[PDB]
Design a protein around this ligand. Structure first.
Ligand SMILES: [Mg+2]
Ligand SMILES: [Mg+2]
Ligand SMILES: [Mg+2]
Ligand SMILES: [Mg+2]
Lengths: 136, 177, 175, 84, 104
RNA sequence: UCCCAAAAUGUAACGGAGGCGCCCAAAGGUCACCUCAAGACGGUUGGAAAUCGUCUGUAGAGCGCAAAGGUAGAAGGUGG
RNA sequence: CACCCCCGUGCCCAUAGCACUGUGGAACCACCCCACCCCAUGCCGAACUGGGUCGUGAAACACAGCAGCGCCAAUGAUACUCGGACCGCAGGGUCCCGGAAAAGUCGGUCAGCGCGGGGGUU
């Protein structure tokens, strides 16, 4: 969710994935296919939903942590400088990236644990399976 | 006044216990020291005197006030402030004091019983943690100040503690069996 | 896998379903360019612990091994492949996957067993006889049973490159 | 007065004019006096025939041709392989 | 340890100098009062105490210094420089020194 | 002094961070010499660190203050 | 550069470094020995230093083996991009044309090159 301590601010830019593996920590995983900002509350909205579906196992890996502070409008003005260090924290995701990947539970019993998680995401994803063997 | 039996009792008896391709290679005694880390709990630009004066009349040498590492940790700590003391012995004065210890030091210790075994400086070097200085052939309460303690270091070319222990004791040393 | 071409220029393939790999050892690092589909259907099975027929256009069957494959992101599709020609008595080192069999005594119990490390690497495989898999006991494993390299029975010879006390599978607790 | 701080913390006004760089590159017919490199630390160390200002700068003692030498980085050297 | 010889050696300027440096391995009793020229790793003169010593080795001190200054002459050298080492310009070494620092 | 500044320089904003209006008869000139942080094992008031000791040790320390570059063959640490 | 090795001093300055192992001794080196004073360790001649064997090669060193770690490091394909030409409301993305990494893989090596002095080939 929210980081523990840091610097305080940032900026904005994009270009395709870079460190989003594939299989690892599980057999089934969910992959993001579009450039976006993933709100930390948009992850909970995913995890939590996923939990419910899984009556146990917790074999859910969320490997897209919010390494980013965004700001906002103190109400209107414009005559002041940097604003709202605290609007919210997001975690820039890029295509091919892997935010989710369950483990242990049946295909179907997974093709749903994701589907749902998809429904609260600002981007389109697609489920991936195996044959992932680069580095280890 | 020692050294022959040093070699002898040790060296020979060593090969006659070991098998050293040389006389040089056998473990020896590099140096014996005395750290006097007093003060800190006792800021006595007075007591500092008790130390050296004494330490010196017991080792026959002027030691160095191993001042503060400039460390100023939360508690009582600061820049480089006199806190402890260093007194390095080696060879003559080493041996001259050394023998005292093996003869009168520990031997003359009420409550004394010998000395723990368990290897120290796995570097074949022995460590000696002393305390009450009230067991010295040179310390006098009827001509001192207050009363303190001290630590002495055993330095030896002793490669392994195996060889260490041996040498250690051969030259003379009380082990609590 | 009848790969035929092998030039720096791939216009003649990039449009036409054809992957593009390279092979070698220390002698010949022949430029290459095999067919999409084929490799695609191929590597699936033999994976990287499977040497296959490499008769390049002209006919010169060669023995190699799937070393490293780098596929496109966004599109699960593979783009490049490295074939490290087989050997005879020694290749280098290989990647062999860990597998389980038989229900574990932790599953029905109250928890689920987890495979801390999917594919495992052992020192020296042994060209000609390199484990195209690795089934492992799990049953015994209860509520916190971790298995490691110092356990897994190896195929007569093969030595474990992976540090021993390293857990390959444990049976994770419930919830 | 009151009972708060003097100036409002968390500001951003100001920075500095600043400079530094390389005044004479490799192959330039340096000269007596010419400055060839302004730097902060010892990025480039006064090679052969180069003096070194107090501000880690570098200059020519004589005339000749500017020359650069980079030994695996870490230590750099500007020299002067005069023509004459 | 090796800091010392590199401290002296370094400070001892090379080409900016033009002059020549005279070493000395008087840590042992087998000195070498060597003389080398800046660039080319070439030793010109040289006057140890290797060819015998007549018993003197800490003693042959100035013998070699005088044996050297004298030496150079058969090369003709006006300017040289003492690239001593860890050796802190004391006696055994000041020997070769003063000795040569006049034998020439 | 950092970042913004788009690998030369330069480059704005009520853009993002932080310091200065000093200090040092020596914290200087020169000449000698030493070399760090830290962990581990073993040792006395000690017992968390700290003092002593022994291994490891590009220095992960230091450099009077803010940062950056720089630096151990010392700009780091003592004495004449 | 007759063959060798040893000592000093360079270039080079990790593909020349480490570690593990073996080789060397009385030519050289070192340890070792004593050291009142020359000069000296804010205490210790441990280190600087003065006077010298024997003994040793153990340590330090030199050399040689080894590549387990370091360090070096392809090719191929990719990232990215100068230039040209397009797409999507936008985040962003593409084609043609050159340039072209980093990481990883193959594999590479435990240097190589000088000057001078010493002692050997009984
Ligand atoms: Mg690399
Ligand atoms: Mg072009
Ligand atoms: Mg363009
Ligand atoms: Mg292109």
């Amino acid at each position: 969710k929210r980081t523990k301590f840091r610097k305080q601010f940032r900026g904005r830019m994009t270009g395709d994935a870079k460190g989003g593996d594939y299989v690892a920590f599980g057999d089934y995983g969910l992959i993001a296919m579009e450039p976006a900002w993933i709100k930390s509350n948009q992850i909970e909205a995913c995890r939590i939903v996923m939990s419910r579906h899984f009556r146990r196992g917790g074999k859910i890996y969320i490997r897209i942590f919010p390494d980013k502070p965004v700001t906002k409008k103190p109400a209107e003005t414009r005559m002041g400088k940097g604003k709202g260090a605290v609007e919210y924290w997001v975690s820039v995701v890029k295509p091919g990236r892997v935010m989710f990947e369950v483990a242990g539970v049946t295909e179907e019993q997974a093709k749903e644990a994701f589907r749902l998680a998809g429904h609260k995401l600002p981007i389109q994803t697609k489920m991936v399976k195996r044959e992932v063997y680069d580095e280890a | 006044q020692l050294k022959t039996k040093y070699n002898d009792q040790v060296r020979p008896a060593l090969m006659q216990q070991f098998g050293y391709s040389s006389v040089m290679a056998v473990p020896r005694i590099e140096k014996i020291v005395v750290n006097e880390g007093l003060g800190s709990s006792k800021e006595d630009s007075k007591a500092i005197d008790k130390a050296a004066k004494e330490l010196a009349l017991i080792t026959l040498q002027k030691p160095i006030i191993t001042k503060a590492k400039k460390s100023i940790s939360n508690f009582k700590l600061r820049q480089g402030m006199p806190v402890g003391i260093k007194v390095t012995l080696r060879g003559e004065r080493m041996y001259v004091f050394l023998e005292k210890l093996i003869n009168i030091g520990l031997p003359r210790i009420r409550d004394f019983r010998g000395i723990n075994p368990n290897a120290f400086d796995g570097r074949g070097n022995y460590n000696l943690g002393i305390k009450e200085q009230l067991i010295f052939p040179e310390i006098t309460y009827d001509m001192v100040d207050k009363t303190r303690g001290m630590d002495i270091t055993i330095v030896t070319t002793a490669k392994t503690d195996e060889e260490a222990r041996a040498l250690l004791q051969s030259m003379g040393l009380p082990f609590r069996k | 896998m009848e790969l035929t071409a092998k030039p720096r220029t791939p216009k003649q393939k990039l449009d036409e379903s054809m992957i593009a790999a390279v092979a070698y050892n220390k002698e010949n690092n022949v430029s290459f360019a095999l067919d999409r589909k084929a490799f695609d259907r191929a590597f699936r099975q033999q994976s990287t612990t499977g040497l296959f027929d490499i008769t390049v256009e002209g006919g010169e069957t060669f023995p190699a091994l799937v070393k490293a494959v780098q596929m496109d992101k966004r599109k699960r599709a593979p783009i490049h492949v490295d074939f490290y020609m087989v050997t005879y008595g020694e290749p280098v080192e290989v990647s062999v996957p860990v597998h389980t069999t038989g229900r574990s005594q932790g599953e029905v119990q109250g928890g689920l067993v987890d495979i801390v490390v999917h594919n495992l690497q052992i020192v020296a495989p042994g060209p000609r006889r390199i484990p195209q898999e690795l089934v492992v006991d799990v049953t015994k494993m209860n509520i916190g049973d971790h298995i490691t390299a110092g356990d897994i029975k190896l195929p007569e010879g093969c030595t474990l490159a992976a540090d021993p006390e390293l857990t390959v599978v444990s049976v994770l607790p419930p919830r | 007065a009151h009972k708060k701080g003097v100036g409002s913390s968390k500001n951003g006004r100001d920075s500095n004019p600043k400079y530094l760089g390389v005044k004479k590159f490799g192959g330039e017919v340096v000269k007596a006096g010419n400055i060839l490199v302004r730097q902060r630390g010892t990025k480039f160390k006064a090679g052969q025939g180069v003096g070194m200002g107090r501000d880690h700068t570098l200059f020519a003692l004589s005339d000749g041709k500017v020359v650069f030498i980079n030994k695996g980085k870490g230590a750099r050297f500007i020299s002067i392989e005069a023509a004459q | 340890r090796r800091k010392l010889r590199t401290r002296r050696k370094v400070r001892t300027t090379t080409a900016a100098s033009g002059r020549l440096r005279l070493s000395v391995y008087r840590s042992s009793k087998h000195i070498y009062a060597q003389i080398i020229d800046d660039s080319r790793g070439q030793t010109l003169a040289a006057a140890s105490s290797a060819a015998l010593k007549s018993g003197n080795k800490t003693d042959t001190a100035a013998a070699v210094g005088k044996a050297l200054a004298a030496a150079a002459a058969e090369k003709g050298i006006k300017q040289v420089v003492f690239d001593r080492g860890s050796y802190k310009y004391h006696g055994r070494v000041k020997a070769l020194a003063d000795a040569a620092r006049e034998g020439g």
